[PDB]
């Protein structure tokens, strides 16, 4: 199975999520257009500069990368290191003094005061499209975008890894490979899924399960996931995500452990069995 088209899109998109830029993407598209209109006129020019020649051989890749970079850069709300108030701020924090509840101590004191979304009338909900533009001043933007990109990379990588492994069904069936699928491929997917499917669903559950009114006793970002890895059962700080989470993870751990012997204790004994039957 030659995966070339799948690469044709999965590599520009991954390079674009890495390279979240608008101006640079439009610049690359402009260069690609200049090379397209003058394709023959540049072919007439000798390809002496080898870097430029391999760039010509990568004209279409560069155009795809530029377009996907334009899309991605548009949607991060990072266009030349700035955020745009395209829609309304969606927060409606109109009052200065109230909703914050201070008198007039600004400048000479009372410089920086943390808003809480739990307070009424300060959070009208998520932004319609793209990152929240109000973060252009918030210093906690850095931590929140850190968490965002972390979760994002984890989900993207998990799904793409799953698909890449999953593509081997046809490799097996075309070449009559029962050994490389029955105890091979499928246990690999069971192991990987038992490890990471749970992670992705916890991340998605975290995204909406608890709000600002539960923030000060809500769980952390990822510590309890590592605590699951610890084979541990705390009794302090348990804002447990959902009913019976402990019961599910206890048995998911054993399910993941069950995949050790596969690829290791099924090929040899089966092939030796068929060998001794073949003698």
């Amino acid at each position: 199975i030659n995966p070339a088209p799948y690469t044709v899109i999965t590599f520009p998109f991954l390079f674009a999520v890495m390279f979240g830029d608008f101006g640079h993407g439009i610049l690359m598209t402009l260069f690609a257009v200049w090379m397209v209109l003058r394709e023959s006129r540049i072919l007439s020019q000798k390809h002496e500069n080898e870097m430029f020649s391999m760039v010509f051989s990568g004209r279409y890749i560069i155009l795809l990368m530029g377009l996907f970079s334009i899309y991605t850069g548009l949607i991060y709300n990072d266009c030349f290191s700035k955020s745009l108030n395209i829609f309304g701020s969606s927060w409606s924090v109109r009052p200065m003094f109230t909703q914050g509840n201070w008198t007039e101590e600004t400048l000479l004191g009372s410089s920086v005061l943390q808003l809480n979304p739990a307070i009424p009338g300060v959070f009208g909900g998520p932004y319609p499209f793209g990152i929240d533009p109000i973060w252009n001043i918030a210093t906690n933007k850095l931590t929140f975008l850190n968490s965002f990109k972390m979760k994002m990379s984890v989900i993207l990588g998990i799904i793409h890894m799953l698909f890449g492994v999953s593509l081997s069904l046809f490799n097996h069936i075309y070449f009559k490979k029962p050994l490389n699928i029955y105890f091979g491929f499928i246990p690999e997917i069971i192991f990987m899924s038992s490890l990471f499917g749970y992670l992705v669903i916890l991340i998605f559950y975290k995204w909406t399960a608890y709000d600002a009114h539960s923030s000060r006793n809500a769980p952390s970002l990822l510590i309890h996931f590592i605590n699951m890895f610890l084979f541990s059962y705390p009794e302090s700080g348990n804002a447990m995500l959902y009913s019976g989470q402990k019961g599910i993870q206890c048995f998911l751990i054993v399910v993941a452990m069950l995949c050790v012997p596969w690829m290791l204790l099924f090929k040899p004994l089966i092939l030796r069995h068929q060998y001794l039957r073949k003698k």
Binding site: I1, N2, A4, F170
Partner: peptide, 8 residues
Amino acid sequence: ELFRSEEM
């Protein structure tokens, strides 16, 4: 379908 090597 998918892409494979052409038949020879």
